[PDB]
Design a binder for this molecule. Structure first.
Ligand SMILES: *[C@@H]1O[C@H](CO)[C@@H](O[C@@H]2O[C@H](CO)[C@@H](O[C@@H]3O[C@H](CO)[C@@H](O)[C@H](O)[C@@H]3O)[C@H](O)[C@H]2NC(C)=O)[C@H](O)[C@H]1NC(C)=O
Ligand SMILES: *[C@@H]1O[C@H](CO)[C@@H](O[C@@H]2O[C@H](CO)[C@@H](O)[C@H](O)[C@H]2NC(C)=O)[C@H](O)[C@H]1NC(C)=O
Ligand SMILES: CC1=C(/C=C/C(C)=C/C=C/C(C)=C/C=O)C(C)(C)CCC1
Ligand SMILES: CCCCCCCCCCCCCCCC(=O)O
Ligand SMILES: CCCCCCCCCCCCCCCC(=O)O
Length: 328
């Protein structure tokens, strides 16, 4: 016994003092220090706080601007909505949770918080997948006379939700569950226990395989052709340098996000994986809580790349904000 086990909780602290309670019933203040809790709640607000207005504003800009109807504007407007949903659904749940030191909103709270946070992170993954292939099709242009235009950009946003709901939602009904994490304040997938009546073994494997490994091999794949193209398979293709210049500033943007995603999300992925092998080992609440709350910048950083790296958007947004002169 290196923590505690219950119906729907695992608290990584030896109930040898009998101080350990459920994160649905009582304040887990015993798990560490008060200042550390209202430290995370102060970080949830700040996230909500740069997130809410930059994601809506992402939406607000694409809204007003009719020239933003391309593959790239689409996927990101999508992401803004993926982010905001974390901000309002997943985040306001965890915020409140940090300031009282437990899920007072009960198990159904641990759903919401953990759902959107699994959603916004996976949408972000699958969208990258779509992105990787669009750049593939538009730069490697490998199939016959084709157009990646307005129509596929709605097939793609619709594909990403499809495969984030394929991962985030199965714990809601009967395949694995959403369970408290580290300082218990954050909630995520049940890796820490078998719990056979939900199939937490099959779910996890799948969850990594389908919704981590695979999408990466595809994004690594689309990468492998673009390295090939720009070297010597984009020589005979004749693309005018003008076209390349701006289209490169659109290639780069994809992979920045590829990396940034992995930078905020590999710490998590790896830490989760590590528990799964060592089911019920010696470790502390501080272990998962860090790559957790950190990782939730995924509701913010995406727009921020789009703000920094894309000149067009940067001149659309600005133009919304003076109201006229620095359009679409
Ligand atoms: C970690 O250990 C603590 C204490 O070592 C557990 O709390 C204890 O929970 C039991 C079971 O609910 C309490 O016993 C109750 O006593 C009355 C006797 O009149 C009985 O009628 C009730 O039905 C119940 O059996 C016990 O008082 C309580 N101990 C105290 C005072 O701390 C705790 O549940 C453990 N953590 C978990 C969630 O595994
Ligand atoms: C709880 O954590 C402890 C580490 O503190 C682990 O207990 C080890 O048990 C194995 C036997 O398989 C021994 O090789 C080690 O001597 C133990 N370590 C210590 C420091 O006591 C264990 O992995 C965890 N779970 C158990 C079985 O209690
Ligand atoms: C995004 C992502 C994943 C989802 C992680 C989860 C379950 C997130 C949910 C809540 C969090 C991380 C709260 C903090 C997979 C499975 C790990 C692997 C890498 C990509
Ligand atoms: C904290 C996240 C940022 C997004 C919220 C921005 C909303 C307020 C924008 C006001 C900008 C004022 C610009 C006036 C300059 C001109 O002239
Ligand atoms: C509502 C909070 C989300 C953040 C989005 C910003 C909305 C505020 C409106 C900004 C528009 C700029 C107004 C023009 C200034 C004058 O001139």
């Amino acid at each position: 016994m290196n923590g505690t086990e219950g119906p729907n909780f695992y608290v990584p602290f030896s109930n040898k003092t009998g101080v350990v309670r459920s994160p649905f019933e009582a304040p887990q203040y015993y798990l560490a220090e008060p200042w550390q809790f209202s430290m995370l709640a102060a970080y949830m607000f700040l996230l909500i706080m740069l997130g809410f207005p930059i994601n809506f504003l992402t939406l607000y800009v694409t809204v007003q601007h009719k020239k933003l109807r391309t593959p790239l504007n689409y996927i990101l407007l999508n992401l803004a909505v993926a982010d905001l949903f974390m901000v309002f659904g997943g985040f306001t749940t965890t915020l409140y949770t940090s300031l009282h030191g437990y899920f007072v909103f009960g198990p159904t709270g641990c759903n919401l918080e953990g759902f959107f946070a699994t959603l916004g992170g996976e949408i972000a993954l699958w969208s990258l997948v779509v992105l990787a292939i669009e750049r593939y099709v538009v730069v490697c242009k490998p199939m016959s006379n084709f157009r990646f235009g307005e129509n596929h950009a709605i097939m793609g946003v619709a594909f990403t939700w499809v495969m984030a709901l394929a991962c985030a939602a199965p714990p809601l009904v009967g395949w694995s569950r959403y369970i408290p994490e580290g300082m218990q304040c954050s909630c995520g997938i049940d890796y820490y226990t078998p719990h056979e009546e939900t199939n937490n073994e099959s779910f996890v494997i799948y969850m990594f395989v389908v919704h981590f490994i695979i999408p990466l091999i595809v994004i690594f794949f689309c990468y492998g052709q673009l390295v090939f193209t720009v070297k010597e398979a984009a020589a005979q293709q004749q693309e005018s340098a003008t076209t390349q210049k701006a289209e490169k500033e659109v290639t780069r943007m994809v992979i920045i996000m590829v990396i940034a995603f992995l930078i905020c999300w590999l710490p998590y992925a790896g830490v989760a994986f590590y528990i799964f092998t060592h089911q019920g080992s010696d470790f502390g609440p501080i272990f998962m809580t860090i790559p957790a709350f950190f990782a939730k910048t995924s509701a913010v950083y995406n727009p921020v790349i789009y703000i920094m790296m894309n000149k067009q958007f940067r001149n659309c947004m600005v133009t919304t904000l003076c109201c006229g002169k620095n359009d679409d």
